Amino acid sequence: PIVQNQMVHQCISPRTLNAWVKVVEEKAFSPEVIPMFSALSCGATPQDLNTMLNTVGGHQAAMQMLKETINEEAAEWDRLHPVHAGPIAPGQMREPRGSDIAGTTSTLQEQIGWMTHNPPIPVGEIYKRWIILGLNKIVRMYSPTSILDIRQGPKEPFRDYVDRFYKTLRAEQANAATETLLVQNANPDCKTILKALGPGATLEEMMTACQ
Amino acid sequence: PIVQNQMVHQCISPRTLNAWVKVVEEKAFSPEVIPMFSALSCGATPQDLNTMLNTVGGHQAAMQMLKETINEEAAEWDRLHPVHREPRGSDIAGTTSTLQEQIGWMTHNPPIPVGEIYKRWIILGLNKIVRMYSPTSILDIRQGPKEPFRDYVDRFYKTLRAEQASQEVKNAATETLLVQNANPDCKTILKALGPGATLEEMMTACQ
């Protein structure tokens, strides 16, 4: 990554490498994997981002989808940024292609150059945005249950029902419709109590009622 | 390794040593071992690279094959670079060069990165080991009777990564062999999507 001490390059630590591998093995592709990826890849170069993705052993179906998503975003970058057929000015470097941001056709020295330039071109943060965009599509696909199927049990605690509701809802999307659906799918006993509170009732008031 | 503070030498940490040993013990020689080796040997000298390889206890068959691959690349370096001091093949490997000489080349201007050159030879040798240690072949990977398509695709690309074919041969297999070896139920739906269908669209269809 790139960090202060002047901005300087550091090798990715054994802790950060092992931390990322264990999260993917344990949590597979739960919504909370994405914020953890973003945290562990703080100030990371495109090389560092590729290192983290390559170290993942299983889930090769998901990684292949992530590869295609990166190529789409890389091609979109090339379309929005045309190539300037000319010499590079003094005290400057070449404008990064889509493949350069991905780290396939750019050295570590060039990546550090862009990130520490003035003005800076944050190729690491741009590439991280493409990865997270691709990871959200995987989390949506790997989401087992749909939001419509989440209904409250016969004598299940309301807290447990709400946990499963917003756990599923977080995965399905990676609103007034969601608020009304929570009361509709609740059991006859609690549903009568929730409607009695009326419109504009906060979740704290709803959970305190059925308890 | 060699790191900033000017470029200065540091001793290899216990964490890095232990991390590399555990990865070799647990994952044996799965494809993901190579990127982990490259990451853990960041800015490593030839001495540091030898230390990591020598600390591996088991898999002595694989380590002997790696030894031979290094000797071939070292011999190839001597051939392409005749003598006429510049580093020889044995100096880059760290067999006949001191730590001071290794630091000397890497921190020179212009720099001769003997660490990165030697790392290239090790990774080249490790790729051959990963290809051999691959259990199943890509032709054997068929979708089960009641197996989910997600599980089938995981096994397909896992095996494809291990064998390490050329990109032309990989695309030849990915296009034809992926849909060919799928079960009759999903195969009918995948062909209905047509040519040039993305993997996302294929997996969404048989879900």
């Binding site: 981002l49 590729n50 390559n54 780290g103 | 790729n127 051959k128 390490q164 050329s166």
Partner: peptide
């Protein structure tokens, strides 16, 4: 010779 296990980069 093998291509490489480095899928990304």
């Amino acid at each position: 010779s093998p291509s490489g296990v480095f899928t990304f980069g």
